[PDB]
Amino acid sequence: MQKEFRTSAYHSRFQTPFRRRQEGKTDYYQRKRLVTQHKAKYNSPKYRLVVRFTNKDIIAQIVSAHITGDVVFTAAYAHELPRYGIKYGLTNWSAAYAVGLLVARRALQKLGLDETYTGVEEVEGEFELTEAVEDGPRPFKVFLDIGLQRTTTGARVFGVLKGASDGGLYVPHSPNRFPGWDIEAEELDAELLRKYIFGGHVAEYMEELLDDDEEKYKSIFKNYIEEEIESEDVEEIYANAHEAIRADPSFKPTEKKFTKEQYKAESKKYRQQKLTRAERQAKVAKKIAEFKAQQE
Amino acid sequence: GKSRGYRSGTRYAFQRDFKKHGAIPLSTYLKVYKVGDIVDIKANGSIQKGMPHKYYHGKTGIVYNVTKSSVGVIINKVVGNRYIEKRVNLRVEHVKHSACRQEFLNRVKSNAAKKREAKANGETVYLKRQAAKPRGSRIISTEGNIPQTLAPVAYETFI
Amino acid sequence: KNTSSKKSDAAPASADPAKAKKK
Amino acid sequence: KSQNVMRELRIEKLVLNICVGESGDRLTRAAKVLEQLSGQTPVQSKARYTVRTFGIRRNEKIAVHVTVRGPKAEEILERGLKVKEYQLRSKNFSATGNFGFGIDEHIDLGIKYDPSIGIYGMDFYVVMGRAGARVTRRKRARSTIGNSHKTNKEDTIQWFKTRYDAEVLDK
Amino acid sequence: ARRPARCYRYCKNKPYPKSRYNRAVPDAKIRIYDLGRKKATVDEFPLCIHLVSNELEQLSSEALEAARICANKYITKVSGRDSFHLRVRVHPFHVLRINKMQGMRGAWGKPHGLAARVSIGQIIMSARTKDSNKDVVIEGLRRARYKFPGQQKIIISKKWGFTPLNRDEYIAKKTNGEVIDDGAYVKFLSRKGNLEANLQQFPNYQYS
RNA sequence: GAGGUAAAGCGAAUGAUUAGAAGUCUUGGGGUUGAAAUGACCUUAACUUAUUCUCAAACUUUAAAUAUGUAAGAAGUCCUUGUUGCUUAAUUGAACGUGGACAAUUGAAUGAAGAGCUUUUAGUGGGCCAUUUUUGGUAAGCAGAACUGGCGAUGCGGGAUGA
RNA sequence: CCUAAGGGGGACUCAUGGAGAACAGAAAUCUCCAGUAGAACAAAAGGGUAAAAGUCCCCUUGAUUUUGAUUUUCAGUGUGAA
RNA sequence: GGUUGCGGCCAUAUCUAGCAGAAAGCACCGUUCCCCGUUCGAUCAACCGUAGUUAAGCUGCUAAGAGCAAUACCGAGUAGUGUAGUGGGAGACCAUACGCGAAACUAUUGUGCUGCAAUCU
Ligand SMILES: [Mg+2]
Ligand SMILES: [Mg+2]
Ligand SMILES: [Mg+2]
Ligand SMILES: [Mg+2]
Ligand SMILES: [Mg+2]
Ligand SMILES: [Mg+2]
Ligand SMILES: [Mg+2]
Ligand SMILES: [Mg+2]
Ligand SMILES: [Mg+2]
Ligand SMILES: [Mg+2]
Ligand SMILES: [Mg+2]
Ligand SMILES: [Mg+2]
Ligand SMILES: [Mg+2]
Ligand SMILES: [Mg+2]
Ligand SMILES: [Mg+2]
Ligand SMILES: [Mg+2]
Ligand SMILES: [Mg+2]
Ligand SMILES: [Mg+2]
Ligand SMILES: [Mg+2]
Ligand SMILES: [Mg+2]
Ligand SMILES: [Mg+2]
Ligand SMILES: [Mg+2]
Ligand SMILES: [Mg+2]
Ligand SMILES: [Mg+2]
Ligand SMILES: [Mg+2]
Ligand SMILES: [Mg+2]
Ligand SMILES: [Mg+2]
Ligand SMILES: [Mg+2]
Ligand SMILES: [Mg+2]
Ligand SMILES: [Mg+2]
Ligand SMILES: [Mg+2]
Ligand SMILES: [Mg+2]
Ligand SMILES: [Mg+2]
Ligand SMILES: [Mg+2]
Ligand SMILES: [Mg+2]
Ligand SMILES: [Mg+2]
Ligand SMILES: [Mg+2]
Ligand SMILES: [Mg+2]
Ligand SMILES: [Mg+2]
Ligand SMILES: [Mg+2]
Ligand SMILES: [Mg+2]
Ligand SMILES: [Mg+2]
Ligand SMILES: [Mg+2]
Ligand SMILES: [Mg+2]
Ligand SMILES: [Mg+2]
Ligand SMILES: [Mg+2]
Ligand SMILES: [Mg+2]
Ligand SMILES: [Mg+2]
Ligand SMILES: [Mg+2]
Ligand SMILES: [Mg+2]
Ligand SMILES: [Mg+2]
Ligand SMILES: [Mg+2]
Ligand SMILES: [Mg+2]
Ligand SMILES: [Mg+2]
Ligand SMILES: [Mg+2]
Ligand SMILES: [Mg+2]
Ligand SMILES: [Mg+2]
Ligand SMILES: [Mg+2]
């Protein structure tokens, strides 16, 4: 016979964590270190590159934090990529690179720093930082926010990192977390990084799987089969997309099939609504009367 | 043996509030302090750097310096028969804007608005605050409120 | 090779409570 | 619906423990047996504290254990149930829906006997679970499993009896 | 050995209990606080009589034991051992100190005994019994009064036994099915919490 | 704004603490000597659950009174735009400013033999008492603290007499 | 007293209870669940700390240089410490 | 209005036990060549969005639910306290005067609100 643990006193003295920590979504330690600004720069904000991965989507946002809540500057989603020519693999490492490049270009379009700070126009996979222009405004400085996602060399968040850096944004970083970093010989093999930028690993998997298991190739790569897209024309898909991303990085919202009021009215039809006090009092009275049958 | 250390007697003063331990809400790090601001001082026990001395816990002062993570606050402390100007470096976790500014700064605006409106109407308005004055005459209606007579009650034991 | 890492913090234990004889 | 596809019971992991009471050559040979059976390098456990009665000391390498998942876990589990001739007790199932048994000789499993190695007994524990346990094990947004989705003793007992045509005693 | 009680009558010092700071403290002379038929149900002994302090004062554990013994002996001798339930309502938790057992240097005393610090109106002893045994129980406490210093009053309680309800509210809650036995005490019905447990615990609850 | 003492609390954490009641497969034991089955029964003792009496200078959710920090304007508020080697992605800010607007109810009360400032030097550095808070001590015309008022340093009327 | 028990980063979560697994029993090791910290943080105590300040791992020397300002004790002197 | 990403305040949001959830989203889910990390592709890493599911997560509703929050002809102007007397009392302590003024208890009510961006039957 052990003591019941979950007493009323246990609940009384319990201190609930922050709402978004109890959801397991925000690391407030890292958030404090990222967001907090030098008090002698007063109202100049720090800008975060929020990078989040869902099971189907890549979300990249440029955010500054304020007391009333975070405020989005620009945002690029992976589902915007089909507009630019990438329809499948919307969560590749290369799709991450494309989303990072798109958000960088879109932010620079919003600011007006398009002609200045074009970025790395010829992606060869070399490590490079956006250098300031003499006698001109400094490049838009942004710090990377990978959230709760673990830091591994080859992770997809650093694809958005490299894309945003190549898009003209100044994002301070090091190359030892990029795919293709040799940890033993501390130098970056830029050829393998460039391979990863243009979907080289996926194309090589297509080629390696096709001659080793055609049935698995048929199930895994269906969309490619009905589009008649082979490995050798994978690279162009990104290279054109790059160009298209640089041609018009502006955000185009999806035309909505229904209005806000129609959406609200449709959703409001479902979801149960709370009972009035009198209703539950009647329920209690019924339960008391209906308890009368087990008097033994 | 006598003990007189830096944080002596701060067992309860420097405690976190009940069910309020742990991480700092981030509005503390988002507030902006400018030279001349009036701030209340309340030491946070969980941040030990830039922490005030126990004297300044509960004191209010003027910001004179702004640094990377801290502000300098001027406090006047009684030393004998005069005040001495004290300059304390405090991280912003132990600092909060004083709410006494916002009441007086609003009364200045209200007086300015009232003055122009009376000026607009070509009349006069009085802006000085007044203490509560004795109440005027009044008439008490007894419809539904005829006086009920009370008497002191006898002594009883209820144990 | 590989060995288990100490998840616990009872460094100056070297014994444990509840471990009472005759129980 | 209680008859949903994602409510399917299936093995999460199998953990093989050999708690040889000492350190040195014998523990090394137990580790060799475990690496032989699983094909994976096992891991050695250190004593949390010192007990003179058991002849162990703190941080002395006592036991060795290994975790296997997938088809190999299934093969090892049925290989061990053959030694038990498919007959466990009701007391062998925990309230959380996991079960275990312990063999006494490792050559009964069906591996070659070596005079240098000798025979070691072995401890088997199977961790049961339905789909969606990753919620409780992932880094971000970790939560708990709903009551109906929880694994319990009765469901595991019935699933074992159905899937292996075995008998669960209770003496 | 023991000084006269006049040396410790008044609450001059702060409470000095047994703790991790004083450990060599003797035991109180009083160890038993409930006497008579302590297992009797609430309905058996409706009448409650209190011995109440009219002093802010300290009562030694020796005096508590002596008065308890006197009252118990008298009431069991006159009315029988099963005619009452006596409860001592003050526990001696304050440690008195003695110095000599030189001069005033290093004069912090050693634990010497125990006393209960009582206020004005604080109940010292309560006796629940039947009505017909009133004059007996009263006379037991009046004798016990002699073992105490200061002024004490014998007050007949308005309530049923040791319950907080008047002798009329208890009958109302009894005929309404709002009271169940709990051994020597009772449990009352609550209109808060799990409805099913409340209904199960009080089957005879005439709900309105 | 700060505070953690008085009070209060313990079917709220920690620690101390009286009494029953109902329950459990490590019940702690005795009997039924059950042929032995640890599988019942009578019992006391453990724990668990909901209760019960009483407590804390070095316990506490709560939480005073008295006491305490700051503010109540012209050195204020607002508008426009000058300076920098600091800051910002910036034409953003930071600080100091030019120019303009708000006139005696110019922004609570009450008082003010006016406010502010400097130099230099005496004596002193044994104290004691009263109310209240308060520590050691059985206590003391004892010893030791807190705030104030006194005596010392002070006569006068009263307490007969008396710092 | 400490080359880490200093510094940075990362991953993990402690005391304890319940239910289970050959030898294994009150105490060896393994598994799941619960677990507001009931542990641990060199040392006396208090405060503080949970995707950490605790446990483990990796890299290190900021336990470095030049001197000013400030806080406590305060005479607003020194010293110590920050 | 729902959902997601990032949040402010940090339980009216937590905890327990049931039930329900259209659309999109989210999620579980499938695989191991590649970067990467493991005793274990469980976590972490990567690939497919292809084979499946709302069972779980998440969300909403239910509960004389625990907790939390708010309110008060609740208790109570009680306890305490600032100030006063050549007040009472041997004392312990108490009453009164001018002020300030609790906590527990009791009852009732409520159970996240909201900012930026994107999206949806
Ligand atoms: Mg981090
Ligand atoms: Mg000492
Ligand atoms: Mg001291
Ligand atoms: Mg405080
Ligand atoms: Mg330090
Ligand atoms: Mg300081
Ligand atoms: Mg006017
Ligand atoms: Mg340790
Ligand atoms: Mg051994
Ligand atoms: Mg004393
Ligand atoms: Mg005695
Ligand atoms: Mg008497
Ligand atoms: Mg104190
Ligand atoms: Mg008290
Ligand atoms: Mg008290
Ligand atoms: Mg209380
Ligand atoms: Mg017997
Ligand atoms: Mg301008
Ligand atoms: Mg001007
Ligand atoms: Mg006023
Ligand atoms: Mg002078
Ligand atoms: Mg002089
Ligand atoms: Mg002088
Ligand atoms: Mg002099
Ligand atoms: Mg002199
Ligand atoms: Mg003298
Ligand atoms: Mg002298
Ligand atoms: Mg007096
Ligand atoms: Mg007086
Ligand atoms: Mg004296
Ligand atoms: Mg006087
Ligand atoms: Mg003299
Ligand atoms: Mg005089
Ligand atoms: Mg005279
Ligand atoms: Mg005289
Ligand atoms: Mg006289
Ligand atoms: Mg450390
Ligand atoms: Mg370190
Ligand atoms: Mg470290
Ligand atoms: Mg860390
Ligand atoms: Mg040094
Ligand atoms: Mg000194
Ligand atoms: Mg100094
Ligand atoms: Mg000084
Ligand atoms: Mg100095
Ligand atoms: Mg100094
Ligand atoms: Mg609405
Ligand atoms: Mg909270
Ligand atoms: Mg759907
Ligand atoms: Mg996987
Ligand atoms: Mg992964
Ligand atoms: Mg669902
Ligand atoms: Mg569902
Ligand atoms: Mg409720
Ligand atoms: Mg409730
Ligand atoms: Mg008074
Ligand atoms: Mg008189
Ligand atoms: Mg009064």
**Residues of chain B found within 8 Å of residue A38, distances taken between Cβ atoms:** 68-69
Element (H, E) at E96: strand E94-98
Q: How far apart are CA C14 and CA E52, in angstroms?
A: 55
Q: What share of chain A is helix, strand, coil (3-state, %, to 5)?
A: 45, 10, 45
Two tokens, residue E160 = 């049923």
If you count DSSP H runs as helices and E runs as strands, how many of each does chain B have, helices first?
Answer: 2, 5
Three-state DSSP at C23 gives: coil
Rounded to the nearest angstrom, the distance between the alpha carbon of D85 and the centre of ligand 58 is 89
Q: Angle at CA C14, nearest 5°, toward C12 and C20?
A: 120
Residues D43, C3: C-beta atoms closer than 8 Å: yes
E72 with E88: CB under 8 angstroms? Answer: no
For residue B115, report the phi and psi dihedrals to the nearest 5 degrees.
Answer: -65, -40
- On whether B12 is known to bind a ligand per the annotation, the reply is yes
Measuring alpha carbon to C1', the residue closest to nucleotide G41 is: C9
Best probe of the A interface among D134, D138, D139, D140, by most A CBs < 10 A, is: D140
* Strand H atom within 7 Å of A147 CB: yes
Three-state DSSP at B150 gives: coil
Rounded to the nearest angstrom, the distance between the alpha carbon of E65 and the centre of ligand 18 is 91
Residues E52, B159: C-beta atoms closer than 8 Å: yes
Three-state DSSP at D97 gives: coil
**E touches which chains (3+ CB pairs under 8 A)?**
A, B
Site of tokens 């009896």: D161
How far is the CA of D118 from the CAs of D23, D25, E183, in angstroms?
16, 12, 65
A197 with A180: CB under 8 angstroms? Answer: no
Q: How far apart are CA E163 and CA E175, in angstroms?
A: 16
Rounded to the nearest angstrom, the distance between the alpha carbon of A152 and the centre of ligand 51 is 10
Strand-pair category, C2-3 with D43-46: parallel
Q: How far apart are CA B133 and CA D67, in angstroms?
A: 84
**Which ligand gives the minimal distance to the CA of A268?**
47
Element (H, E) at A284: helix A277-290
For residue E77, report the phi and psi dihedrals to the nearest 5 degrees.
Answer: -70, -40
What experiment produced this structure? X-ray
Select from D149, D151, D132, D150 the least CA-distant residue to D141.
D132
Two tokens, residue A199 = 């979907």
**Residues of chain C found within 8 Å of residue D50, distances taken between Cβ atoms:** 14-15
Q: How far is CA A266 from the centre of its chain?
A: 29
DSSP string, A190-253: HHHHHHHHTTHHHHHHHHHHHTT-HHHHHHHTHHHHHHT--GGGHHHHHHHHHHHHHH-----P
Q: Give me the long-range contacts of E107-114 (CB less than 8 A, separation at least 24).
A: E110/E24, E111/E22, E111/E24, E111/E25, E111/E26, E112/E2, E112/E3, E112/E26, E113/E2, E113/E8, E113/E26, E113/E60, E113/E61, E113/E62, E114/E25, E114/E26, E114/E27, E114/E28, E114/E29, E114/E60, E114/E61
Residues A40, B67: C-beta atoms closer than 8 Å: yes
* Strand H nucleotides in reach of protein CB atoms, 7 A cut-off: 1-2, 4-11, 13-23, 25-30, 33-40, 42-68, 91-94, 107-121
Rounded to the nearest angstrom, the distance between the alpha carbon of E49 and the centre of ligand 33 is 59
Three-state DSSP at A93 gives: helix
CB-based burial of residue A130 (10 Å sphere; 0-12 exposed, 13-18 middle, 19+ buried)? buried
**Residues of chain A found within 8 Å of residue B29, distances taken between Cβ atoms:** 32, 35-36
Residues B157, E123: C-beta atoms closer than 8 Å: no
Contact E153/B at CB under 8 A: no
Residues E50, B159: C-beta atoms closer than 8 Å: yes
* Strand H atom within 7 Å of A260 CB: yes
Site of tokens 């975070």: A70
Q: How far apart are CA A206 and CA A214, in angstroms?
A: 10
**Which ligand gives the minimal distance to the CA of B16?**
4
Q: Report the distance from CA of residue B24 to the C1' of nucleotide G69 in Å, as an integer.
A: 29
E150 with E53: CB under 8 angstroms? Answer: yes
Select from B69, B9, B52, B79 the least CA-distant residue to B61.
B52
Sheet containing strand E47-53, edge to edge, reads: E34-36, E84-88, E123-129, E47-53, E152-160
Contact C5/D at CB under 8 A: no
